[PDB]
């Protein structure tokens, strides 16, 4: 499970790096779906079986289905931006690259100084997550239903046709 975790993490990192630099929207969505599958494999390596199952069920099965739906609705063939390639010229991307590298260095320095006994990877089943979800986390579930209802109402109101 160690080798699976590192290979899935490397694949997720490489796919995300390909996503943020690609110019084709559908290719970028495909690489991010690959990254989501890799992060689900990371979840399965750590014993969070329900989290990986919902990563492919919802994150890599519903949300980016919606993204691919919107992309093919717009018929994005790379117009007025693919003719530019502005983010590939140094003068746009080096500055944010130093910004993100400095933030990553600071977060990594903070991460390396924590008590670490290691992750045993004992599988936490979905039954225990469901017990905690309807035990100590009842109001979280009810208000999350209300939150998704709010998002539904907002997206319906904005994304109509008329």
């Amino acid at each position: 499970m160690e080798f699976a975790f590192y290979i899935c993490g490397l694949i997720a990192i490489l796919a995300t790096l390909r996503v943020i630099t690609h110019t084709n929207p559908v290719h970028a969505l495909l690489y991010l779906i690959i990254s989501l599958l890799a992060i689900s494999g990371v979840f399965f390596s750590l014993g969070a079986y329900f989290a990986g199952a919902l990563e492919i069920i919802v994150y890599a099965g519903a949300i980016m289905v919606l993204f691919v739906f919107v992309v093919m609705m717009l018929n994005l063939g790379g117009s007025e931006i693919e003719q530019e390639r502005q983010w590939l010229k140094p003068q746009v991307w080096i500055g944010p690259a130093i910004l993100s590298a400095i933030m990553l260095v600071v977060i990594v320095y903070a991460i390396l100084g924590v008590n670490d006994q290691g992750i045993d990877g004992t599988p936490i089943s979905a039954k225990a997550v469901g017990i905690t979800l309807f035990g100590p986390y009842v109001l979280a579930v009810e208000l999350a239903s209300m939150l998704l209802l709010a998002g539904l109402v907002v997206a319906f109101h904005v994304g109509r046709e008329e």
Binding site: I111, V138, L143, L149, A150, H157
Partner: protein, 480 residues
Amino acid sequence: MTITPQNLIALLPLLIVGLTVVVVMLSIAWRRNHFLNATLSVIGLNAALVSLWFVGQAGAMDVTPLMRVDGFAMLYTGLVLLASLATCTFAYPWLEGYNDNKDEFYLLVLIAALGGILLANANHLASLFLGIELISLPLFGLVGYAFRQKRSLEASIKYTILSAAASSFLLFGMALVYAQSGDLSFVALGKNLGDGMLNEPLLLAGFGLMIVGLGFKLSLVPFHLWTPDVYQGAPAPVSTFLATASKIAIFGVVMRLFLYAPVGDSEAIRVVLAIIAFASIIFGNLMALSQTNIKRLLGYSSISHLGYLLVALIALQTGEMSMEAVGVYLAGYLFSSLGAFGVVSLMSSPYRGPDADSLFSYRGLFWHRPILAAVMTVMMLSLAGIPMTLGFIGKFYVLAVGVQAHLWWLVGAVVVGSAIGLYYYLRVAVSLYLHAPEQPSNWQYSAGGIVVLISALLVLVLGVWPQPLISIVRLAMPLM
């Protein structure tokens, strides 16, 4: 833990607002009626405000591993409910001119009020994250409720992307905090440290990213650049709600987080918050010096006033009257912002389509709307911390709290920013009383005018006699 009928009695405003959300949704599904759905929403909000009495009779106790209900939660629930009721009252005459569906506005207002109540009662990272999101997403819908208007669509896009970024920042911060600690409750964020090792690197980084997200949601410098654009582009009742209820609820849950956490008295977080408060006060006052639009001016005003609140927050562990200062300041700032954005909403209603400009043109307002001009200039005086006003009492509380804890840089910043605020607030007031070149009538417009007049009378009366407000804020004390 578990859920008890007594815990259900302490759950009363949350359950009442959620039941109102479901009832209003089913009423919209039955037939789209603007007056009936607005009446149902204000009836539910008033029912929650009344059920605060039964919550107080029930006492103070921990309803969930997530929620903790006490006097402080009651006070901030009341403030958020009053802001939501004022938002509905101002929104009805504005929505009278909206050609699309007018009924989803009150549904989103009720859901955001539910998120505000959850933030008021939050005692957990889960409840804090969910309450922040439950405030933010209906505000995404309400800010861009007039999406055919170009400015409102711009404000909605900016608010949505920036608040999603801030929510992800906050989530990563909670992830680092939970990785360090292992407990998500507020009382255990740094409990497993000892012997002067409170400045744990991963815990400090997680609280820093949480500070990034919350300081976005509180318009604290340098996470403040969204505030004038989103305040201007949004509808004026939405500007009222976003200026009052969201800021009050998020600051209250920040107050509980920094009061209950054992890492809240860390000196590094204290110095970082001092830097943020200094920069927030000075920058928010300086950017409003040369503003001709009232919405951006009130956005920079909100930045400066949240800086004053943060100054009151920094002295939480050192001082003893810090929470009571925050409560008095929040009541005064709520009433002043309600009056100012209510005058803006009453003079910007009905919504005259997505094509006509929504410019305020506050100059010479007294010679055709005298009562609104008097209310508005009372608000402009109250935001300046001038006596006879409740805003002065809040400023006096912030100054006393800063003097007690010897936060002299913050006291000097408060005074300098107060002088700059004096300049631009007084410029707005005298422009209201100048002469203009050129120059509704239902009971709901009258209700909005009655609301802003009642806010003006409350500001004046509690500025000349603040003892009832001080007593009812000191009655609202959380568990120690």
